[PDB]
Amino acid sequence: TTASATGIATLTSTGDVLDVWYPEIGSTDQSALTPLEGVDEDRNVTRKIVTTTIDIDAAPTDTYDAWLRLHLLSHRVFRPHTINLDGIFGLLNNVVWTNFGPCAVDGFALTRARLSRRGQVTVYSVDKFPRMVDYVVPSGVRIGDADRVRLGAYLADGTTVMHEGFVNFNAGTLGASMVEGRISAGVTVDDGTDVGGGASIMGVISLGKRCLLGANSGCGIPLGDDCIIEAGLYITAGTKVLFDGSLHKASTLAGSNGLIFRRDSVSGQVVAVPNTKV
Amino acid sequence: TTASATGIATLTSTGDVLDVWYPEIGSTDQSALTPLEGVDEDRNVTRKIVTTTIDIDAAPTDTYDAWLRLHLLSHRVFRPHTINLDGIFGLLNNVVWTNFGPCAVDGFALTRARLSRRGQVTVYSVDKFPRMVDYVVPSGVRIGDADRVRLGAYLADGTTVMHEGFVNFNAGTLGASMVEGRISAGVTVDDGTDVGGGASIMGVISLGKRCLLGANSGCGIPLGDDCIIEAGLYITAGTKVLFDGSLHKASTLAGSNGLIFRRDSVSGQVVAVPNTKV
Amino acid sequence: TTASATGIATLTSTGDVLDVWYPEIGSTDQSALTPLEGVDEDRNVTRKIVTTTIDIDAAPTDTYDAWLRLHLLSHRVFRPHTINLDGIFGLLNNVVWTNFGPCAVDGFALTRARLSRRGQVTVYSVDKFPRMVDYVVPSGVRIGDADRVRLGAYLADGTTVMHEGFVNFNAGTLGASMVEGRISAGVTVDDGTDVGGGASIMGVISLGKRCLLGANSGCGIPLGDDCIIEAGLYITAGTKVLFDGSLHKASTLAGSNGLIFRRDSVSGQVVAVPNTKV
Ligand SMILES: CC(C)(COP(=O)(O)OP(=O)(O)OC[C@H]1O[C@@H](n2cnc3c(N)ncnc32)[C@H](O)[C@@H]1OP(=O)(O)O)[C@@H](O)C(=O)NCCC(=O)NCCSC(=O)CCC(=O)O
Ligand SMILES: CC(C)(COP(=O)(O)OP(=O)(O)OC[C@H]1O[C@@H](n2cnc3c(N)ncnc32)[C@H](O)[C@@H]1OP(=O)(O)O)[C@@H](O)C(=O)NCCC(=O)NCCSC(=O)CCC(=O)O
Ligand SMILES: CC(C)(COP(=O)(O)OP(=O)(O)OC[C@H]1O[C@@H](n2cnc3c(N)ncnc32)[C@H](O)[C@@H]1OP(=O)(O)O)[C@@H](O)C(=O)NCCC(=O)NCCSC(=O)CCC(=O)O
């Protein structure tokens, strides 16, 4: 798809792009943005309006292109896996994310000293991906600890990411989900799927509708709909699971509907049983 | 109980209450609060003093009432389960919690643009419950990552909530505890109980005194005093536990004193044994 | 070692040290620091330059000494366990860490009210240890959620601490590691060791090179090089592990090289097998 937006970029004096903010997708309106242009000598950066036009099926070719792609995902214009992100790690700079805005990592010690004359300097994160909410708050969502949702996360209407939840870029919820565990990059969960506290979903992997991952559980395989993984139980691709009297590697149960995975507390054996009613 | 306090409320131009801060319980002193009244046109809110009087045994009837109840818990005037919270979710608004203060979720994009002229806008959370410490810091407590304690948490003197700890509203510690795992809404742990790193306590559930939940453990049943759950072991209500040669569903071991729960590493069987010395 | 640095201390009106910032180790240059000296009457603190000289092998004797030691670790001048920290907990004050800077816990309610006239007051943490990044950002590191790295953490070049990672003081990475779980105080992991999401390493304990702790795993013993602990599996010192037909308490497998620990999904038995290729 040809996608375009007008945004405001933060550039170092050597021309490295620390960030871009695109408030709206597909608009040429600049009036939100002209008051934000200028030069900050304490950070040694310039903020300047840019217009970015991309082919979402092509690999990104520069830092601006990479930033627009993350915005398209978090504004929910594009779902996870629908936009080409190949090579994005190479295009994003490591940035010090502060209460004063993004700062270059090279020379940060001098930067911090300059900024400290203006007020206390707090560093929220040092990374190539910022906190999503600092660029877009999608509608119909709650996020307890907004450090734990990267820009490029897709959070469908009706999602709650609790404080223990984490959602990486190119990942998230396609419908209404309670997310209290970790959704790795490239993982999606479909409508009504709830991820219990401290649960882990490995990234290849997606879960269908109305799944339940128990607290402290783990899922290393794709699941279909109406599956349950018992609290505390980690299903790896290599786990051998007893189903109807036979052992199956979990990788072969990928995409199954209506299975409850538990570890028998008497024998210690991993079992899967049908999820009755459904 | 009749409870009353004077506080300062933040109201949208449509009269929705985004927050109330009650610095003290039971006082009519306004002199801390009159300098904080006014109108913020970038957020489109008004801050105004309110006096709120409630019956803690009755269901809350409006947003102010709900906010006072959360304060009563976190100031430790009332313990968890001692105040009626029925319907509170319906009375609290979803709010964008920023470095500039609370902001309405509707229209936040315009709000963010207005505020960005004043300085970098950082969103800490988007939720119906704020961070406790932004309203009350109780005495004798440490909190590593104060994003992870909701207003309405009760943290007794001598509590440390480490960065991996999480304490929901209507929950917490009745005495001195090291909390490095998740205390769900309506869960309390009694004096000397330590919750290990990444442990999960389901919410009906409380733990007694001097309990130890191992790292990455889970507890889905009430426990009495001097119980231990091995690291990595999740006791669900349905788990069948071997105790003195017989199998018992864990729900039937609810409230037991002096049991150590472990998963036998040879057989894989969940067992409970007496906690000797005690 | 004799170690010395010039820094800027924040002192209460009773002379308690809330913090010290030492921008550089071993320098007498004050020109970064003289613009930061002064008195803040809303917090009731004074900021003043100090010169601190210590013997790293001796126990710290005052709060300034304790702060310099934490800096020496996070600037990577000293590795974990190389500096004497005995009694440090007694020398650090509990502090309220705010957007305005450190504040005393005694009297914070009055402090908060004073500061609220200047702007929204946000409390990041209440603890004896601050967030490392607010004092030093070491080179070659990423940190997703910088609430989760305490000052006194040592993060070697090439380390990424993801949002689920946590690194305590006197702890961390000796080389390039992806850290998505919890590195307790006094724990180190050597080059190429990756700590999976939600994994727990107990603190006596270190891991060698190229180890892999699966998501939601736990390690209660020292490991040598090229060990793997399966996702979801917690090895406690007391766990009895089957290796080559014999049962061994895990404490006796301390420091082993090239072992893969798994829980057999059929029998529920904890086993260790050689890590083939290596
Ligand atoms: C595996 C399930 C789904 C099974 O539950 P069900 O309700 O289907 O079964 P149930 O009625 O308990 O049990 C039916 C029968 O199976 C037995 N049974 C159950 N589990 C067993 C096991 N592992 N081994 C042997 N038997 C077992 C019961 O004793 C009962 O036996 P009889 O037939 O003999 O009676 C559950 O235990 C579970 O883990 N749910 C996880 C939910 C969760 O953690 N939600 C996430 C939000 S909670 C959260 O996030 C916590 C907060 C936080 O962590 O921060
Ligand atoms: C289950 C317990 C409590 C058992 O410990 P004890 O000290 O009572 O027993 P011990 O001396 O190790 O063992 C007594 C005997 O039982 C055997 N034994 C122990 N566990 C076994 C098992 N699971 N299967 C079979 N045998 C077992 C031992 O080998 C020994 O055998 P012989 O009799 O043959 O010798 C422990 O292993 C545990 O998990 N503690 C958890 C502590 C914890 O995680 N604390 C939280 C803070 S730590 C934390 O939070 C980490 C940081 C973070 O995560 O962020
Ligand atoms: C234990 C291992 C390492 C084993 O893996 P390997 O690749 O060596 O083996 P494999 O090819 O799967 O399996 C070899 C043979 O062993 C069998 N096998 C494997 N596990 C078994 C078990 N537990 N019980 C019985 N059999 C088992 C397989 O079925 C296969 O059988 P046949 O020979 O019959 O074929 C793995 O499953 C694991 O847990 N890796 C953890 C990785 C991880 O979590 N990384 C952290 C980043 S991921 C993360 O952090 C998630 C994000 C987040 O949490 O936030």
PDB file of C-alpha atoms in Angstrom, chain C residues 36-182:
ATOM      1  CA  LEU C  36      23.655  22.863  40.294  1.00  0.00           C
ATOM      2  CA  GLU C  37      24.498  23.995  43.826  1.00  0.00           C
ATOM      3  CA  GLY C  38      21.811  25.804  45.850  1.00  0.00           C
ATOM      4  CA  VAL C  39      18.836  25.517  48.132  1.00  0.00           C
ATOM      5  CA  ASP C  40      15.386  24.288  47.219  1.00  0.00           C
ATOM      6  CA  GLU C  41      12.922  25.502  49.821  1.00  0.00           C
ATOM      7  CA  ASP C  42       9.960  23.475  48.520  1.00  0.00           C
ATOM      8  CA  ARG C  43      11.932  20.240  49.167  1.00  0.00           C
ATOM      9  CA  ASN C  44      13.841  21.696  52.128  1.00  0.00           C
ATOM     10  CA  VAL C  45      17.152  20.509  50.703  1.00  0.00           C
ATOM     11  CA  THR C  46      20.569  21.900  49.838  1.00  0.00           C
ATOM     12  CA  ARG C  47      22.707  20.738  46.926  1.00  0.00           C
ATOM     13  CA  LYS C  48      26.392  20.961  47.546  1.00  0.00           C
ATOM     14  CA  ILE C  49      29.623  19.786  45.937  1.00  0.00           C
ATOM     15  CA  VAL C  50      31.571  17.135  47.774  1.00  0.00           C
ATOM     16  CA  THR C  51      34.830  15.363  47.169  1.00  0.00           C
ATOM     17  CA  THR C  52      34.716  11.706  48.262  1.00  0.00           C
ATOM     18  CA  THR C  53      37.760   9.441  48.722  1.00  0.00           C
ATOM     19  CA  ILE C  54      37.383   5.841  49.731  1.00  0.00           C
ATOM     20  CA  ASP C  55      39.160   2.491  50.181  1.00  0.00           C
ATOM     21  CA  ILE C  56      37.044   0.067  48.153  1.00  0.00           C
ATOM     22  CA  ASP C  57      38.208  -2.822  50.292  1.00  0.00           C
ATOM     23  CA  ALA C  58      37.034  -1.287  53.492  1.00  0.00           C
ATOM     24  CA  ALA C  59      33.376  -1.273  54.578  1.00  0.00           C
ATOM     25  CA  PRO C  60      31.643   2.030  53.668  1.00  0.00           C
ATOM     26  CA  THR C  61      31.470   4.417  56.642  1.00  0.00           C
ATOM     27  CA  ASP C  62      28.983   7.106  55.617  1.00  0.00           C
ATOM     28  CA  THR C  63      26.254   7.789  53.036  1.00  0.00           C
ATOM     29  CA  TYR C  64      28.582   9.615  50.560  1.00  0.00           C
ATOM     30  CA  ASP C  65      30.948   6.565  50.601  1.00  0.00           C
ATOM     31  CA  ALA C  66      27.979   4.274  49.846  1.00  0.00           C
ATOM     32  CA  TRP C  67      26.893   6.428  46.912  1.00  0.00           C
ATOM     33  CA  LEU C  68      30.363   6.508  45.393  1.00  0.00           C
ATOM     34  CA  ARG C  69      30.513   2.683  45.554  1.00  0.00           C
ATOM     35  CA  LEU C  70      27.219   2.353  43.605  1.00  0.00           C
ATOM     36  CA  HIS C  71      28.584   4.732  41.009  1.00  0.00           C
ATOM     37  CA  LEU C  72      31.878   2.781  40.653  1.00  0.00           C
ATOM     38  CA  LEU C  73      29.829  -0.367  39.796  1.00  0.00           C
ATOM     39  CA  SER C  74      27.491   1.339  37.302  1.00  0.00           C
ATOM     40  CA  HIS C  75      30.271   3.265  35.567  1.00  0.00           C
ATOM     41  CA  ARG C  76      31.885  -0.203  35.220  1.00  0.00           C
ATOM     42  CA  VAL C  77      35.072   0.870  37.001  1.00  0.00           C
ATOM     43  CA  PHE C  78      34.526  -2.017  39.416  1.00  0.00           C
ATOM     44  CA  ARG C  79      32.738  -5.309  38.733  1.00  0.00           C
ATOM     45  CA  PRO C  80      30.182  -6.929  41.054  1.00  0.00           C
ATOM     46  CA  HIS C  81      31.748  -8.401  44.248  1.00  0.00           C
ATOM     47  CA  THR C  82      34.961  -6.423  43.791  1.00  0.00           C
ATOM     48  CA  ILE C  83      34.021  -3.605  46.199  1.00  0.00           C
ATOM     49  CA  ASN C  84      33.102  -3.996  49.841  1.00  0.00           C
ATOM     50  CA  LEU C  85      29.391  -3.137  50.395  1.00  0.00           C
ATOM     51  CA  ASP C  86      29.025  -4.353  53.909  1.00  0.00           C
ATOM     52  CA  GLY C  87      26.494  -2.322  55.819  1.00  0.00           C
ATOM     53  CA  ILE C  88      25.317  -0.305  52.829  1.00  0.00           C
ATOM     54  CA  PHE C  89      21.676  -0.753  53.616  1.00  0.00           C
ATOM     55  CA  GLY C  90      22.158   1.015  56.888  1.00  0.00           C
ATOM     56  CA  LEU C  91      23.881   3.961  55.257  1.00  0.00           C
ATOM     57  CA  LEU C  92      21.358   4.728  52.452  1.00  0.00           C
ATOM     58  CA  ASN C  93      18.265   6.668  53.346  1.00  0.00           C
ATOM     59  CA  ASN C  94      14.799   5.843  52.110  1.00  0.00           C
ATOM     60  CA  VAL C  95      13.977   8.545  49.541  1.00  0.00           C
ATOM     61  CA  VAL C  96      10.968   9.629  47.550  1.00  0.00           C
ATOM     62  CA  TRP C  97      12.278   9.851  43.940  1.00  0.00           C
ATOM     63  CA  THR C  98      10.216  12.507  42.127  1.00  0.00           C
ATOM     64  CA  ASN C  99      10.147  14.500  38.895  1.00  0.00           C
ATOM     65  CA  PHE C 100      11.484  17.361  41.013  1.00  0.00           C
ATOM     66  CA  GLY C 101      14.327  15.266  42.382  1.00  0.00           C
ATOM     67  CA  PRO C 102      14.867  13.375  45.564  1.00  0.00           C
ATOM     68  CA  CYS C 103      12.675  14.290  48.570  1.00  0.00           C
ATOM     69  CA  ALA C 104      12.776  13.149  52.209  1.00  0.00           C
ATOM     70  CA  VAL C 105      10.292  10.663  53.207  1.00  0.00           C
ATOM     71  CA  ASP C 106       9.619  12.424  56.560  1.00  0.00           C
ATOM     72  CA  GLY C 107       7.425  15.326  55.874  1.00  0.00           C
ATOM     73  CA  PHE C 108       6.701  14.302  52.254  1.00  0.00           C
ATOM     74  CA  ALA C 109       3.118  15.211  52.506  1.00  0.00           C
ATOM     75  CA  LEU C 110       4.031  18.847  53.176  1.00  0.00           C
ATOM     76  CA  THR C 111       6.709  18.624  50.470  1.00  0.00           C
ATOM     77  CA  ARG C 112       4.257  17.353  47.861  1.00  0.00           C
ATOM     78  CA  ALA C 113       1.842  20.208  48.610  1.00  0.00           C
ATOM     79  CA  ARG C 114       4.672  22.814  48.223  1.00  0.00           C
ATOM     80  CA  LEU C 115       5.864  21.275  44.984  1.00  0.00           C
ATOM     81  CA  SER C 116       2.356  20.995  43.531  1.00  0.00           C
ATOM     82  CA  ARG C 117       2.322  24.763  43.113  1.00  0.00           C
ATOM     83  CA  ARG C 118       5.047  24.436  40.587  1.00  0.00           C
ATOM     84  CA  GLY C 119       3.584  21.633  38.591  1.00  0.00           C
ATOM     85  CA  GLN C 120       2.289  18.055  38.713  1.00  0.00           C
ATOM     86  CA  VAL C 121       4.278  15.920  41.211  1.00  0.00           C
ATOM     87  CA  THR C 122       5.059  12.369  40.018  1.00  0.00           C
ATOM     88  CA  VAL C 123       6.691   9.865  42.340  1.00  0.00           C
ATOM     89  CA  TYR C 124       8.768   7.299  40.368  1.00  0.00           C
ATOM     90  CA  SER C 125       9.918   5.151  43.315  1.00  0.00           C
ATOM     91  CA  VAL C 126      10.292   5.213  47.106  1.00  0.00           C
ATOM     92  CA  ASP C 127      13.523   3.408  47.983  1.00  0.00           C
ATOM     93  CA  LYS C 128      17.024   3.439  49.199  1.00  0.00           C
ATOM     94  CA  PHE C 129      18.387   2.828  45.654  1.00  0.00           C
ATOM     95  CA  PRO C 130      17.624   5.119  42.757  1.00  0.00           C
ATOM     96  CA  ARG C 131      17.198   4.269  39.052  1.00  0.00           C
ATOM     97  CA  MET C 132      20.656   3.820  37.640  1.00  0.00           C
ATOM     98  CA  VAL C 133      20.043   5.789  34.440  1.00  0.00           C
ATOM     99  CA  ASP C 134      19.272   8.947  36.438  1.00  0.00           C
ATOM    100  CA  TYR C 135      23.036   8.954  37.478  1.00  0.00           C
ATOM    101  CA  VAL C 136      24.828   7.005  34.658  1.00  0.00           C
ATOM    102  CA  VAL C 137      23.966   5.615  31.247  1.00  0.00           C
ATOM    103  CA  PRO C 138      26.839   3.195  30.458  1.00  0.00           C
ATOM    104  CA  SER C 139      27.958   2.805  26.810  1.00  0.00           C
ATOM    105  CA  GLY C 140      26.664   0.026  24.507  1.00  0.00           C
ATOM    106  CA  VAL C 141      23.499  -0.733  26.530  1.00  0.00           C
ATOM    107  CA  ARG C 142      19.743  -0.704  25.981  1.00  0.00           C
ATOM    108  CA  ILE C 143      17.244  -0.665  28.782  1.00  0.00           C
ATOM    109  CA  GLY C 144      13.536  -0.953  27.948  1.00  0.00           C
ATOM    110  CA  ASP C 145      12.024   0.056  31.281  1.00  0.00           C
ATOM    111  CA  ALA C 146      14.701   1.965  33.169  1.00  0.00           C
ATOM    112  CA  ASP C 147      12.818   1.682  36.395  1.00  0.00           C
ATOM    113  CA  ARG C 148      14.171  -1.874  36.539  1.00  0.00           C
ATOM    114  CA  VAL C 149      17.911  -1.250  36.779  1.00  0.00           C
ATOM    115  CA  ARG C 150      19.106  -0.048  40.221  1.00  0.00           C
ATOM    116  CA  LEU C 151      22.096   2.186  40.650  1.00  0.00           C
ATOM    117  CA  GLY C 152      24.949  -0.208  41.432  1.00  0.00           C
ATOM    118  CA  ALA C 153      24.050  -2.498  38.485  1.00  0.00           C
ATOM    119  CA  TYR C 154      26.891  -3.366  36.118  1.00  0.00           C
ATOM    120  CA  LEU C 155      25.792  -3.705  32.445  1.00  0.00           C
ATOM    121  CA  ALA C 156      28.557  -4.626  30.079  1.00  0.00           C
ATOM    122  CA  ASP C 157      28.849  -3.337  26.587  1.00  0.00           C
ATOM    123  CA  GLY C 158      26.424  -5.152  24.286  1.00  0.00           C
ATOM    124  CA  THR C 159      23.724  -5.776  26.983  1.00  0.00           C
ATOM    125  CA  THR C 160      20.053  -5.297  26.404  1.00  0.00           C
ATOM    126  CA  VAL C 161      17.834  -5.317  29.479  1.00  0.00           C
ATOM    127  CA  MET C 162      14.326  -5.751  28.142  1.00  0.00           C
ATOM    128  CA  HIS C 163      11.240  -4.431  29.933  1.00  0.00           C
ATOM    129  CA  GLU C 164      10.796  -7.757  31.732  1.00  0.00           C
ATOM    130  CA  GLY C 165      14.470  -7.747  32.808  1.00  0.00           C
ATOM    131  CA  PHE C 166      15.513  -6.533  36.259  1.00  0.00           C
ATOM    132  CA  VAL C 167      19.064  -5.979  37.514  1.00  0.00           C
ATOM    133  CA  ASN C 168      19.751  -5.325  41.185  1.00  0.00           C
ATOM    134  CA  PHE C 169      22.779  -3.565  42.682  1.00  0.00           C
ATOM    135  CA  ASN C 170      26.104  -5.427  42.842  1.00  0.00           C
ATOM    136  CA  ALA C 171      24.870  -7.511  39.886  1.00  0.00           C
ATOM    137  CA  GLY C 172      24.687  -7.778  36.212  1.00  0.00           C
ATOM    138  CA  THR C 173      26.330  -8.758  32.955  1.00  0.00           C
ATOM    139  CA  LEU C 174      30.061  -9.196  32.361  1.00  0.00           C
ATOM    140  CA  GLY C 175      29.655  -9.216  28.631  1.00  0.00           C
ATOM    141  CA  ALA C 176      27.033  -9.079  25.902  1.00  0.00           C
ATOM    142  CA  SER C 177      23.734 -10.505  27.178  1.00  0.00           C
ATOM    143  CA  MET C 178      19.984 -10.230  26.450  1.00  0.00           C
ATOM    144  CA  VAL C 179      18.433  -9.908  29.881  1.00  0.00           C
ATOM    145  CA  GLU C 180      14.627 -10.422  30.014  1.00  0.00           C
ATOM    146  CA  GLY C 181      14.499 -11.814  33.546  1.00  0.00           C
ATOM    147  CA  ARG C 182      15.673 -11.052  37.057  1.00  0.00           C
TER     148      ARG C 182
END
